[PDB]
Structures are given as structure tokens and as C-alpha cells.
Design a protein around this ligand. Structure first.
Ligand code: HEM
Length: 79
């Protein structure tokens, strides 16, 4: 499940869709979209080449199908 993948790999730094490292860059829809992360595929692609301070999630670690599940959970969970 997308929710479980998020809890495992992302919730530590993005609890409830926030950001413990860079306060301004939360997962809230308006914030992420202002930075070009709008679609499920945008989220999936972003984790492979993220911004400073965020570890990169390669395809070997998180296969395409799972990256999409994470994206599906992110867009629906954080308005
Ligand atoms: C696969 C799980 C994760 C997802 C889905 C995710 C997703 C995102 C997204 C969409 C953004 C906003 C990008 C922007 O607006 O420019 C972001 C930013 C960020 N994430 Fe994550 N993240 C994940 C895991 C992590 C982890 C584990 C950490 C903490 C070690 C982390 C730290 C950050 C930081 C520091 C930023 C700011 C990057 C910058 O300053 O450009 N993220 N993340």
C-alpha cells in the first residue's frame, strides 16, 4: 500500500505531510505544486532526484510501481 510505503520511507521527515528538515518545503498541495510536483508521476520522479537534504530513492530501492503508489498516497493525503 502507498500509505505503508510512505510510513516506511517518508513519514520520518514528512510527518503528516510536513517537513522536519526544510520547514517551507512541505507536501501540502499548494506548496508542492508551486515547485512543479503536481502529478503522481511528478512525485515518483522527484524522489529519484530530490533536493538537498533528502536522500535519493533509486529504482532499485523503490521500483516504479511502488514509487507510483507513494505518489498516489501523497497527492490524496496532503491538501
Ligand atoms: C519516498 C519518501 C519521500 C517522499 C515521497 C518525499 C517527497 C518530497 C517532496 C515532494 C518534497 C518537496 C519538493 C519541493 O517542493 O521542492 C520533498 C522535499 C524534501 N524532503 Fe522529502 N520525501 C521523502 C523522503 C524524505 C526523507 C526520508 C527526508 C529526510 C531525511 C526528506 C527530506 C526532504 C527535504 C530536506 C526536502 C527539501 C528539499 C529542498 O530543500 O529542495 N524527504 N520531499
Amino acid at each position: 500500500g502507498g500509505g505503508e510505503l510512505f510510513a516506511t520511507h517518508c513519514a520520518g521527515c514528512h510527518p503528516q505531510g510536513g517537513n522536519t528538515v526544510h520547514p517551507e518545503k512541505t507536501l501540502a498541495r499548494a506548496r508542492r505544486e508551486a515547485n512543479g510536483i503536481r502529478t503522481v508521476r511528478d512525485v515518483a520522479a522527484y524522489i529519484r532526484n530530490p533536493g538537498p537534504g533528502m536522500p535519493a530513492f533509486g529504482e532499485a530501492m523503490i521500483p516504479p510501481a511502488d514509487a507510483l503508489k507513494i505518489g498516489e498516497y501523497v497527492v490524496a493525503s496532503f491538501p
